[PDB]
Amino acid sequence: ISGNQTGIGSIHPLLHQNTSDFSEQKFSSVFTGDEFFLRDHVVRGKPVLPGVAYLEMAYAAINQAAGSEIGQDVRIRLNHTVWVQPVVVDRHSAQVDISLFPEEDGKITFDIYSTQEDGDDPVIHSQGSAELASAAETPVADLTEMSRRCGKGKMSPDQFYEEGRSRGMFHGPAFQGIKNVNIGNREVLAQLQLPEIVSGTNEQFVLHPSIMDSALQTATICIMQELTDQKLILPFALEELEVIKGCSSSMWAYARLSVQKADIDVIDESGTVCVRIKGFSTRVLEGEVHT
Protein backbone atom coordinates (compact mmCIF):
# COMPACT_ATOMS: atom_id res chain seq x y z
CA ILE A 1 0.00 0.00 0.00
CA SER A 2 1.43 3.37 -1.13
CA GLY A 3 -1.14 5.85 0.19
CA ASN A 4 0.55 9.25 0.59
CA GLN A 5 4.08 7.82 0.96
CA THR A 6 4.50 7.55 -2.84
CA GLY A 7 2.15 7.66 -5.83
CA ILE A 8 -0.56 4.96 -5.83
CA GLY A 9 -0.20 2.59 -8.79
CA SER A 10 -2.10 -0.10 -10.66
CA ILE A 11 -2.56 -3.40 -8.93
CA HIS A 12 -1.54 -5.06 -12.19
CA PRO A 13 -1.21 -3.79 -15.81
CA LEU A 14 -4.62 -5.42 -16.61
CA LEU A 15 -6.26 -4.73 -13.21
CA HIS A 16 -5.75 -1.08 -12.32
CA GLN A 17 -8.06 -0.41 -9.38
CA ASN A 18 -10.26 -2.21 -6.84
CA THR A 19 -13.76 -0.72 -6.98
CA SER A 20 -15.46 -3.33 -4.76
CA ASP A 21 -18.55 -2.35 -2.76
CA PHE A 22 -20.92 -4.19 -0.41
CA SER A 23 -22.90 -5.51 -3.40
CA GLU A 24 -19.96 -6.80 -5.54
CA GLN A 25 -16.21 -7.58 -5.73
CA LYS A 26 -14.99 -5.62 -8.76
CA PHE A 27 -12.07 -3.95 -10.47
CA SER A 28 -11.65 -1.30 -13.14
CA SER A 29 -8.98 -0.53 -15.73
CA VAL A 30 -8.56 2.14 -18.43
CA PHE A 31 -6.75 1.33 -21.68
CA THR A 32 -5.81 3.89 -24.33
CA GLY A 33 -4.30 1.74 -27.09
CA ASP A 34 -0.67 2.66 -26.30
CA GLU A 35 -0.24 -0.58 -24.29
CA PHE A 36 1.81 -3.32 -25.99
CA PHE A 37 -1.12 -5.79 -25.92
CA LEU A 38 -3.31 -3.34 -27.87
CA ARG A 39 -0.91 -1.56 -30.25
CA ASP A 40 0.48 -4.92 -31.38
CA HIS A 41 -2.87 -6.77 -31.64
CA VAL A 42 -4.76 -5.13 -34.47
CA VAL A 43 -7.67 -6.81 -36.24
CA ARG A 44 -8.31 -5.32 -39.68
CA GLY A 45 -7.14 -1.91 -38.66
CA LYS A 46 -8.65 -1.78 -35.15
CA PRO A 47 -6.69 -2.41 -31.91
CA VAL A 48 -8.64 -5.12 -30.08
CA LEU A 49 -8.09 -6.36 -26.53
CA PRO A 50 -6.79 -9.90 -27.05
CA GLY A 51 -8.55 -12.96 -25.54
CA VAL A 52 -5.48 -13.76 -23.43
CA ALA A 53 -5.64 -10.38 -21.67
CA TYR A 54 -9.07 -11.34 -20.30
CA LEU A 55 -7.64 -14.59 -18.89
CA GLU A 56 -4.83 -12.74 -17.10
CA MET A 57 -7.25 -10.07 -15.90
CA ALA A 58 -9.49 -12.80 -14.38
CA TYR A 59 -6.47 -14.57 -12.87
CA ALA A 60 -5.19 -11.34 -11.28
CA ALA A 61 -8.69 -10.42 -9.98
CA ILE A 62 -9.20 -13.86 -8.43
CA ASN A 63 -5.76 -13.79 -6.84
CA GLN A 64 -6.64 -10.40 -5.29
CA ALA A 65 -10.14 -11.39 -4.13
CA ALA A 66 -9.23 -14.81 -2.72
CA GLY A 67 -6.20 -13.40 -0.91
CA SER A 68 -4.81 -15.70 1.82
CA GLU A 69 -7.09 -18.61 0.82
CA ILE A 70 -4.37 -18.99 -1.85
CA GLY A 71 -1.68 -20.91 0.00
CA GLN A 72 1.35 -22.46 -1.67
CA ASP A 73 -0.50 -25.63 -2.68
CA VAL A 74 -3.56 -23.95 -4.20
CA ARG A 75 -3.87 -23.12 -7.90
CA ILE A 76 -6.33 -21.07 -9.89
CA ARG A 77 -8.20 -22.96 -12.57
CA LEU A 78 -10.41 -21.17 -15.10
CA ASN A 79 -13.35 -23.24 -16.34
CA HIS A 80 -15.65 -22.47 -19.33
CA THR A 81 -14.81 -18.98 -20.57
CA VAL A 82 -16.36 -17.21 -23.55
CA TRP A 83 -15.45 -14.09 -25.49
CA VAL A 84 -18.78 -12.57 -26.47
CA GLN A 85 -18.02 -9.12 -27.81
CA PRO A 86 -14.67 -7.43 -28.50
CA VAL A 87 -13.18 -4.44 -26.75
CA VAL A 88 -12.12 -2.07 -29.55
CA VAL A 89 -9.70 0.72 -28.65
CA ASP A 90 -9.50 2.82 -31.85
CA ARG A 91 -10.96 6.31 -31.38
CA HIS A 92 -11.24 6.59 -27.58
CA SER A 93 -10.00 4.94 -24.36
CA ALA A 94 -11.88 1.92 -22.99
CA GLN A 95 -12.85 1.42 -19.36
CA VAL A 96 -12.92 -2.33 -18.77
CA ASP A 97 -14.35 -3.69 -15.52
CA ILE A 98 -14.45 -7.16 -13.99
CA SER A 99 -16.91 -8.41 -11.32
CA LEU A 100 -16.36 -11.64 -9.38
CA PHE A 101 -19.14 -13.64 -7.64
CA PRO A 102 -18.08 -16.31 -5.13
CA GLU A 103 -20.61 -19.19 -5.39
CA GLU A 104 -21.89 -21.59 -2.70
CA ASP A 105 -20.00 -24.59 -4.13
CA GLY A 106 -16.64 -22.72 -4.00
CA LYS A 107 -16.67 -21.72 -7.68
CA ILE A 108 -16.26 -18.07 -8.72
CA THR A 109 -18.05 -16.60 -11.73
CA PHE A 110 -16.74 -13.50 -13.49
CA ASP A 111 -18.09 -10.95 -15.95
CA ILE A 112 -15.84 -8.61 -17.91
CA TYR A 113 -17.74 -5.62 -19.24
CA SER A 114 -17.71 -1.95 -20.19
CA THR A 115 -20.00 1.10 -20.08
CA GLN A 116 -19.77 4.32 -22.13
CA GLU A 117 -21.45 6.54 -19.51
CA ASP A 118 -22.33 5.87 -15.88
CA GLY A 119 -25.46 3.72 -15.45
CA ASP A 120 -25.58 2.67 -19.12
CA ASP A 121 -26.47 -0.94 -19.86
CA PRO A 122 -23.06 -2.69 -19.55
CA VAL A 123 -21.69 -4.39 -22.62
CA ILE A 124 -20.58 -7.93 -21.70
CA HIS A 125 -17.23 -8.72 -23.36
CA SER A 126 -16.49 -12.03 -21.65
CA GLN A 127 -17.95 -14.40 -19.08
CA GLY A 128 -16.46 -17.37 -17.31
CA SER A 129 -15.95 -19.26 -14.08
CA ALA A 130 -13.08 -20.41 -11.96
CA GLU A 131 -12.14 -22.45 -8.89
CA LEU A 132 -9.24 -22.81 -6.49
CA ALA A 133 -7.74 -26.30 -6.90
CA SER A 134 -5.30 -28.39 -4.82
CA ALA A 135 -1.95 -28.24 -6.58
CA ALA A 136 -1.24 -31.96 -7.04
CA GLU A 137 0.75 -33.40 -9.94
CA THR A 138 2.99 -31.32 -12.23
CA PRO A 139 2.47 -32.81 -15.76
CA VAL A 140 5.46 -33.26 -18.01
CA ALA A 141 5.83 -33.23 -21.77
CA ASP A 142 8.10 -35.33 -23.92
CA LEU A 143 9.36 -32.53 -26.17
CA THR A 144 11.46 -35.06 -28.14
CA GLU A 145 8.49 -37.28 -29.04
CA MET A 146 6.40 -34.15 -29.74
CA SER A 147 9.02 -32.84 -32.19
CA ARG A 148 9.24 -36.29 -33.78
CA ARG A 149 5.52 -36.48 -34.51
CA CYS A 150 5.53 -32.90 -35.85
CA GLY A 151 7.97 -33.58 -38.70
CA LYS A 152 5.64 -32.97 -41.67
CA GLY A 153 6.81 -29.39 -42.29
CA LYS A 154 8.43 -26.24 -40.87
CA MET A 155 6.61 -22.89 -40.74
CA SER A 156 8.82 -19.85 -40.08
CA PRO A 157 7.69 -16.67 -38.23
CA ASP A 158 8.19 -14.81 -41.51
CA GLN A 159 5.69 -17.12 -43.18
CA PHE A 160 3.16 -17.06 -40.33
CA TYR A 161 3.08 -13.35 -39.46
CA GLU A 162 2.95 -12.38 -43.13
CA GLU A 163 0.02 -14.76 -43.71
CA GLY A 164 -1.64 -13.04 -40.74
CA ARG A 165 -1.18 -9.55 -42.19
CA SER A 166 -2.63 -10.93 -45.46
CA ARG A 167 -5.78 -12.09 -43.64
CA GLY A 168 -6.08 -8.86 -41.63
CA MET A 169 -4.51 -10.11 -38.35
CA PHE A 170 -1.65 -7.75 -37.43
CA HIS A 171 0.62 -9.16 -34.73
CA GLY A 172 3.02 -6.36 -33.91
CA PRO A 173 6.53 -6.97 -32.47
CA ALA A 174 5.34 -7.59 -28.88
CA PHE A 175 3.06 -10.41 -30.13
CA GLN A 176 5.56 -12.16 -32.43
CA GLY A 177 6.43 -14.77 -29.84
CA ILE A 178 6.62 -17.73 -32.27
CA LYS A 179 10.25 -18.59 -33.25
CA ASN A 180 9.51 -21.85 -35.12
CA VAL A 181 6.54 -24.09 -35.85
CA ASN A 182 6.80 -27.84 -36.54
CA ILE A 183 3.67 -29.12 -38.24
CA GLY A 184 2.28 -32.58 -37.49
CA ASN A 185 -0.97 -34.33 -38.33
CA ARG A 186 -3.70 -32.55 -36.28
CA GLU A 187 -0.94 -31.39 -33.91
CA VAL A 188 1.78 -28.74 -33.91
CA LEU A 189 4.76 -27.83 -31.75
CA ALA A 190 5.92 -24.22 -31.63
CA GLN A 191 8.99 -22.72 -30.02
CA LEU A 192 8.12 -19.48 -28.18
CA GLN A 193 10.28 -16.58 -27.02
CA LEU A 194 9.23 -13.41 -25.19
CA PRO A 195 9.93 -10.66 -27.77
CA GLU A 196 12.85 -8.39 -26.95
CA ILE A 197 10.61 -5.28 -27.01
CA VAL A 198 8.81 -6.58 -23.85
CA SER A 199 11.79 -8.39 -22.27
CA GLY A 200 11.40 -6.05 -19.28
CA THR A 201 7.87 -7.37 -18.44
CA ASN A 202 8.31 -11.07 -17.63
CA GLU A 203 7.89 -10.57 -13.85
CA GLN A 204 4.72 -8.44 -14.25
CA PHE A 205 2.40 -11.21 -15.48
CA VAL A 206 1.53 -14.82 -14.67
CA LEU A 207 -0.25 -15.38 -17.99
CA HIS A 208 2.00 -13.13 -20.11
CA PRO A 209 -0.09 -11.87 -23.06
CA SER A 210 2.86 -12.17 -25.48
CA ILE A 211 3.49 -15.81 -24.58
CA MET A 212 -0.11 -16.80 -24.13
CA ASP A 213 -1.27 -15.20 -27.41
CA SER A 214 1.63 -16.93 -29.18
CA ALA A 215 0.25 -20.17 -27.68
CA LEU A 216 -3.22 -19.41 -29.09
CA GLN A 217 -1.55 -18.50 -32.42
CA THR A 218 0.00 -21.99 -32.38
CA ALA A 219 -3.44 -23.54 -31.82
CA THR A 220 -4.94 -21.48 -34.66
CA ILE A 221 -2.24 -22.89 -36.97
CA CYS A 222 -3.40 -26.36 -35.90
CA ILE A 223 -7.07 -25.50 -36.40
CA MET A 224 -6.49 -23.71 -39.73
CA GLN A 225 -5.13 -27.00 -41.12
CA GLU A 226 -8.80 -28.08 -41.33
CA LEU A 227 -10.37 -24.81 -42.68
CA THR A 228 -10.56 -22.64 -45.86
CA ASP A 229 -7.18 -21.02 -46.56
CA GLN A 230 -7.61 -17.32 -45.98
CA LYS A 231 -10.10 -17.25 -43.06
CA LEU A 232 -9.23 -14.98 -40.14
CA ILE A 233 -10.18 -16.84 -36.95
CA LEU A 234 -10.30 -15.37 -33.45
CA PRO A 235 -10.70 -16.85 -29.93
CA PHE A 236 -14.24 -17.80 -29.07
CA ALA A 237 -14.12 -20.00 -25.95
CA LEU A 238 -12.04 -22.30 -23.84
CA GLU A 239 -13.28 -25.09 -21.56
CA GLU A 240 -10.44 -25.13 -19.05
CA LEU A 241 -7.20 -23.36 -18.21
CA GLU A 242 -4.96 -24.50 -15.39
CA VAL A 243 -1.95 -22.55 -14.21
CA ILE A 244 0.58 -25.09 -12.90
CA LYS A 245 3.75 -23.08 -12.89
CA GLY A 246 5.32 -19.75 -13.73
CA CYS A 247 5.96 -19.14 -17.43
CA SER A 248 9.53 -18.27 -18.36
CA SER A 249 10.68 -16.34 -21.43
CA SER A 250 11.65 -19.38 -23.55
CA MET A 251 8.74 -21.82 -23.85
CA TRP A 252 7.04 -24.33 -26.15
CA ALA A 253 3.42 -24.57 -27.19
CA TYR A 254 2.08 -27.97 -28.08
CA ALA A 255 -1.36 -27.95 -29.65
CA ARG A 256 -3.56 -30.84 -30.79
CA LEU A 257 -7.04 -31.07 -32.21
CA SER A 258 -9.62 -32.73 -29.92
CA VAL A 259 -16.63 -26.76 -33.86
CA GLN A 260 -12.96 -27.72 -34.08
CA LYS A 261 -11.45 -27.44 -30.61
CA ALA A 262 -7.80 -27.67 -29.65
CA ASP A 263 -5.94 -28.55 -26.47
CA ILE A 264 -2.77 -26.58 -25.72
CA ASP A 265 0.11 -27.17 -23.36
CA VAL A 266 2.56 -24.34 -22.70
CA ILE A 267 5.81 -25.97 -21.68
CA ASP A 268 9.09 -24.66 -20.23
CA GLU A 269 12.56 -25.76 -21.46
CA SER A 270 12.69 -28.49 -18.79
CA GLY A 271 9.56 -30.20 -20.17
CA THR A 272 7.28 -29.07 -17.35
CA VAL A 273 3.77 -28.13 -18.46
CA CYS A 274 3.25 -24.60 -17.02
CA VAL A 275 -0.21 -23.82 -18.39
CA ARG A 276 -2.67 -26.38 -19.70
CA ILE A 277 -5.69 -25.41 -21.81
CA LYS A 278 -8.49 -27.70 -22.90
CA GLY A 279 -11.19 -27.16 -25.51
CA PHE A 280 -9.99 -23.87 -27.07
CA SER A 281 -12.23 -22.88 -30.01
CA THR A 282 -12.36 -20.03 -32.52
CA ARG A 283 -14.86 -18.29 -34.83
CA VAL A 284 -14.34 -16.81 -38.28
CA LEU A 285 -14.37 -13.03 -38.63
CA GLU A 286 -15.77 -11.72 -41.88
CA GLY A 287 -15.68 -8.00 -42.47
CA GLU A 288 -14.58 -5.64 -39.68
CA VAL A 289 -14.80 -6.06 -35.93
CA HIS A 290 -17.91 -4.31 -34.53
CA THR A 291 -19.27 -3.73 -31.02
Which residues in the chain are followed by a discontinuity, with C-to-N distance exceeding 2.5 angstroms?
258
Please select the residue that binds Na ion; options are 81, 218, 220, 281, rule is CB under 5 A: 220
* Separation between Cα atoms, residue 107 and residue 132, nearest integer Å: 8
Distance CA 40, CA 30 (A): 17
* Residue whose CB is less far from Cl ion, 45 or 153: 45
Query: By the 8 A CB rule, do 273 and 237 touch?
Result: no
The reply to whether 41 belongs to the active site is yes
Decide if 28 contacts 95 (C-beta within 8 A).
yes
Selecting among 213, 263, 265, 268, the annotated active-site residue is: 213
69 binds, among Cl ion, Na ion, none (CB under 5 to 8 A by kind): none
Residue 50's binding partner, choosing from Cl ion, Na ion, none, with beta-carbon cut-off 5 to 8 A by kind? Na ion
User: Who's near 78: CB < 8 A, 6+ residues apart?
Assistant: 55, 58, 59, 128, 129, 130, 238, 240, 241, 242
Binding to Cl ion by residue 90, rule CB under 5 A?
no
By CB under 5 A, is residue 48 in contact with Cl ion?
Answer: no
CB within 8 A of 28, min separation 6: which ones? Answer: 16, 17, 19, 95, 96, 97
Q: Which of 52, 169, 233, 289 binds Cl ion (CB under 5 A)?
A: 289
Nearer to Na ion, 108 or 174 (CB): 174
Of the candidates 44, 77, 167, 186, which one interacts with Cl ion according to CB under 5 A? 44
- CB under 5 to 8 A by kind: which of Cl ion, Na ion, none does 278 bind? none
- Chosen from Na ion, Cl ion, none, partner binding at 44 (C-beta under 5 to 8 Å by type): Cl ion
E strand or H helix at 148: helix 143-149
Site for Cl ion, rule CB under 5 A: 44, 46, 288-289
Site for Na ion, rule CB under 5 A: 50-51, 220
Catalytic residues: 41, 213
